[PDB]
Amino acid sequence: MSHHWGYGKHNGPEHWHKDFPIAKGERQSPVDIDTHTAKYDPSLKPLSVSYDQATSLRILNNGHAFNVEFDDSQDKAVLKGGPLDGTYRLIQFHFHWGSLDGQGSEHTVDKKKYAAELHLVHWNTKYGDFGKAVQQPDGLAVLGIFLKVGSAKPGLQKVVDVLDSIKTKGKSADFTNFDPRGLLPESLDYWTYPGSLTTPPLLECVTWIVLKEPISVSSEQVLKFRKLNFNGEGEPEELMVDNWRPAQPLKNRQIKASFK
């Protein structure tokens, strides 16, 4: 019932440029990762993902995805190294997923679409908070992880099991004591490039770090994502599926690989 951007024919990615002309900008995300033209950069550092002191707080259905939110008021869960200068603090994670196992990811790999994509969102501590960070060209670092359907991911199950309590837009629930390390693959090999948010306001503030190795989740786990709703409670049901933006033009960018 409310006026909002979304993923429908009438309010989806093809419309967003009218309110957010940066949608047609020079560093938009996601992109297709052409693995054959990405260059290995020996100058890149190992990525340092340090999530041992992470403090999860809450899970929220914001009408576009669900966010698992963290206490970012101290250096507790940080990303550094790789392509990054300085230290970026974890604020939230969320996913993008499809109506069918053959689509759902935002980034693609040689045109391959995965069933879903996880975004671990971090802000550059030099700018003091998330709101100020998104006003900067190096304000955010997003760790992107592909999901394929296969074996269950045990570290995902606590998330799946709470989704029924946040079915509709605006619902939240406690989500303490969640260890986000259980959402990572074994390998930290990655691609990186400069880009943007993949949702309005589409701000060009992101260093993307996209892991090469997908995680596998079960058919049952991703089905439960698809029972969420875009609508509010008491409104007609519109399933939260296909909340992904398609690949955008690479323009004058290079994608760098951390591996040979």
Ligand SMILES: O[B-]1(O)OCc2ccccc21
């Ligand atoms: O993928 B997204 O555009 O969704 C919300 C978000 C927040 C921070 C960085 C990137 C994103």
Ligand SMILES: OB1OCc2ccccc21
């Ligand atoms: O502001 B709007 O939110 C959803 C929608 C659908 C059609 C036309 C306008 C709007």
Ligand SMILES: OB1OCc2ccccc21
């Ligand atoms: O600029 B827009 O064209 C269609 C629409 C729907 C919802 C929100 C914004 C827009």
Ligand SMILES: [Zn+2]
């Ligand atoms: Zn995202």
